[PDB]
Design a protein around this ligand. Structure first.
Ligand SMILES: [Cu+]
Ligand SMILES: [Cu+]
Ligand SMILES: [Cu+]
Ligand SMILES: [Cu+]
Ligand SMILES: [Cu+]
Ligand SMILES: [Cu+]
Ligand SMILES: [Cu+]
Ligand SMILES: [Cu+]
Ligand SMILES: [Cu+]
Ligand SMILES: [Cu+]
Ligand SMILES: [Cu+]
Ligand SMILES: [Cu+]
Ligand SMILES: [Cu+]
Ligand SMILES: [Cu+]
Ligand SMILES: [Cu+]
Ligand SMILES: [Cu+]
Ligand SMILES: [Cu+]
Ligand SMILES: [Cu+]
Ligand SMILES: [Cu+]
Ligand SMILES: [Cu+]
Ligand SMILES: [Cu+]
Ligand SMILES: [Cu+]
Ligand SMILES: [Cu+]
Ligand SMILES: [Cu+]
Ligand SMILES: [Cu+]
Ligand SMILES: [Cu+]
Ligand SMILES: [Cu+]
Ligand SMILES: [Cu+]
Ligand SMILES: [Cu+]
Ligand SMILES: [Cu+]
Ligand SMILES: [Cu+]
Ligand SMILES: [Cu+]
Ligand SMILES: [Cu+]
Ligand SMILES: [Cu+]
Ligand SMILES: [Cu+]
Ligand SMILES: [Cu+]
Ligand SMILES: [Cu+]
Ligand SMILES: [Cu+]
Ligand SMILES: [Cu+]
Ligand SMILES: [Cu+]
Ligand SMILES: [Cu+]
Ligand SMILES: [Cu+]
Ligand SMILES: [Cu+]
Ligand SMILES: [Cu+]
Ligand SMILES: [Cu+]
Ligand SMILES: [Cu+]
Ligand SMILES: [Cu+]
Ligand SMILES: [Cu+]
Ligand SMILES: [Cu+]
Ligand SMILES: [Cu+]
Ligand SMILES: [Cu+]
Ligand SMILES: [Cu+]
Ligand SMILES: [Cu+]
Ligand SMILES: [Cu+]
Ligand SMILES: [Cu+]
Ligand SMILES: [Cu+]
Ligand SMILES: [Cu+]
Ligand SMILES: [Cu+]
Ligand SMILES: [Cu+]
Ligand SMILES: [Cu+]
Ligand SMILES: [Cu+]
Ligand SMILES: [Cu+]
Ligand SMILES: [Cu+]
Ligand SMILES: [Cu+]
Ligand SMILES: [Cu+]
Ligand SMILES: [Cu+]
Ligand SMILES: [Cu+]
Ligand SMILES: [Cu+]
Ligand SMILES: [Cu+]
Ligand SMILES: [Cu+]
Ligand SMILES: [Cu+]
Ligand SMILES: [Cu+]
Ligand SMILES: [Cu+]
Ligand SMILES: [Cu+]
Ligand SMILES: [Cu+]
Ligand SMILES: [Cu+]
Ligand SMILES: [Cu+]
Ligand SMILES: [Cu+]
Ligand SMILES: [Cu+]
Ligand SMILES: [Cu+]
Lengths: 126, 126, 126, 126
């Protein structure tokens, strides 16, 4: 897909990462809201905050990875590393409420899946 | 899905609107980039600008519509009206390059589909 | 600033609206976080949700209003109306906690100021 | 500002980084639009693309850095590294058009300033 500098990149891995980022951003926005409406909250504040970060970073990553013109591997690697890191953190935080709140079980799966997609694409941008 | 103030809302129409916004934001980000890489551009500048607006508004609309806690129909109606309006404008602009650039044919379909989803949900929030 | 279609627009009002949107988005992001950390919360859930919507819409509005190329008054009016409406809603919600939480007093002022800037610019785009 | 895990962080450096991210996001959005309207473009396509990435990452970074609740230094470091990297890339790209287009001179200064603010805050999160 387009420039020589993106020669040898897995276009399927790029497509999977973009779809995973958009699904994971929406999952995290939905999960921050679901935790907000739980008669519990108070105990879910780090979870809500991490959901908000994870939605913001997945949104930005989906946009950066969607652009081929004037591709810069340094920018793309740094953005993928940020998204991998926040997805890992948000997956772990949501998994802690997997039994207390069904929304966090589903969101934990979304974060873990997007973490894997970012890591797989990052590993191939050498 | 959650509060009494969202009694009588079509949850399926709400879900379709959220998925359409995320697919249309990514379609418009991809199309701004595709037009940027076209040996043409120069003639595609309004198209690129409208793609950027349409991605920004679809992103915001997907997030607002994903939230049920403390739902406010005035805010939701105003955001859906904005998204309907920009999707209409971006659909028309991309359709003009439908024969010159395949990306704009696909993006025009995305904008028209998301315009319909916003209008259908807006009509039922009375 | 640029096209004939933006002839007769107040460039100072446009600049004030953009700066107000960015200051108000950050104020609302900060206030959602401040309410999240308040030993209270539980009672601040509509406030947090409205802060999140208001940040998302102010962010999108700042970007749309920053663009002059292929200006479309219908899109700009609809986006300003959405931002005015959410700033009004978020200003009212934060003002309710003005005495309980200092963050919401400061955020209420930010929302009211950005509401005024959107309304003033909207009134002149006839 | 709030949790023990943010003990020893420079609150002034945190505030400067947030303001720099919001000013730099708007500078880059404005510069992508300014390059789009330049009778040149064609030659400014990498510049426009990098402006779009830099606006998206600065927007996300401003939001993440605005949140104190459940602070995670790994997430914050990774996001600051991404923002530093894209600001460096966008500063260099805009500087190349500093003499051809006044918008890119002003945007290059914005990118360089925000790069410095991210690097200074990152260095102190050890
Ligand atoms: Cu991704
Ligand atoms: Cu993601
Ligand atoms: Cu997510
Ligand atoms: Cu949640
Ligand atoms: Cu949660
Ligand atoms: Cu959560
Ligand atoms: Cu998450
Ligand atoms: Cu994420
Ligand atoms: Cu991502
Ligand atoms: Cu991620
Ligand atoms: Cu999570
Ligand atoms: Cu959770
Ligand atoms: Cu949860
Ligand atoms: Cu969760
Ligand atoms: Cu998640
Ligand atoms: Cu989550
Ligand atoms: Cu994720
Ligand atoms: Cu996540
Ligand atoms: Cu990912
Ligand atoms: Cu990814
Ligand atoms: Cu939608
Ligand atoms: Cu849409
Ligand atoms: Cu779209
Ligand atoms: Cu396009
Ligand atoms: Cu186009
Ligand atoms: Cu376009
Ligand atoms: Cu579009
Ligand atoms: Cu859109
Ligand atoms: Cu939408
Ligand atoms: Cu739309
Ligand atoms: Cu379009
Ligand atoms: Cu087009
Ligand atoms: Cu096109
Ligand atoms: Cu298009
Ligand atoms: Cu489109
Ligand atoms: Cu389009
Ligand atoms: Cu659309
Ligand atoms: Cu669109
Ligand atoms: Cu829509
Ligand atoms: Cu919609
Ligand atoms: Cu504004
Ligand atoms: Cu605003
Ligand atoms: Cu605000
Ligand atoms: Cu607050
Ligand atoms: Cu609040
Ligand atoms: Cu609030
Ligand atoms: Cu607010
Ligand atoms: Cu706002
Ligand atoms: Cu605004
Ligand atoms: Cu507003
Ligand atoms: Cu508010
Ligand atoms: Cu409040
Ligand atoms: Cu508050
Ligand atoms: Cu508030
Ligand atoms: Cu506010
Ligand atoms: Cu507020
Ligand atoms: Cu506001
Ligand atoms: Cu507000
Ligand atoms: Cu405003
Ligand atoms: Cu405004
Ligand atoms: Cu910053
Ligand atoms: Cu920045
Ligand atoms: Cu910038
Ligand atoms: Cu520029
Ligand atoms: Cu440029
Ligand atoms: Cu540029
Ligand atoms: Cu830039
Ligand atoms: Cu930036
Ligand atoms: Cu930044
Ligand atoms: Cu940056
Ligand atoms: Cu730049
Ligand atoms: Cu440039
Ligand atoms: Cu320029
Ligand atoms: Cu520039
Ligand atoms: Cu810049
Ligand atoms: Cu720039
Ligand atoms: Cu920057
Ligand atoms: Cu920049
Ligand atoms: Cu920075
Ligand atoms: Cu920074």
């Amino acid at each position: 897909t387009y420039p020589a500098d993106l020669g040898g990149v897995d276009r399927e891995a790029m497509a999977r990462c973009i779809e995973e980022c958009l699904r994971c951003a929406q999952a995290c926005t939905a999960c921050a809201d679901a935790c907000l409406s739980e008669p519990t909250v108070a105990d879910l504040t780090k979870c809500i905050r991490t959901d908000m970060d994870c939605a913001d970073v997945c949104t930005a990553t989906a946009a950066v990875l969607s652009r081929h013109t004037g591709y810069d591997a340094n920018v793309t690697r740094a953005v993928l590393q940020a998204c991998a890191t926040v997805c890992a953190a948000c997956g772990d935080e949501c998994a802690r409420h997997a039994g207390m709140h069904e929304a966090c079980r589903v969101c934990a799966e979304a974060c873990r899946s997007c973490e894997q997609a970012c890591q797989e694409l990052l590993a191939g941008l050498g």
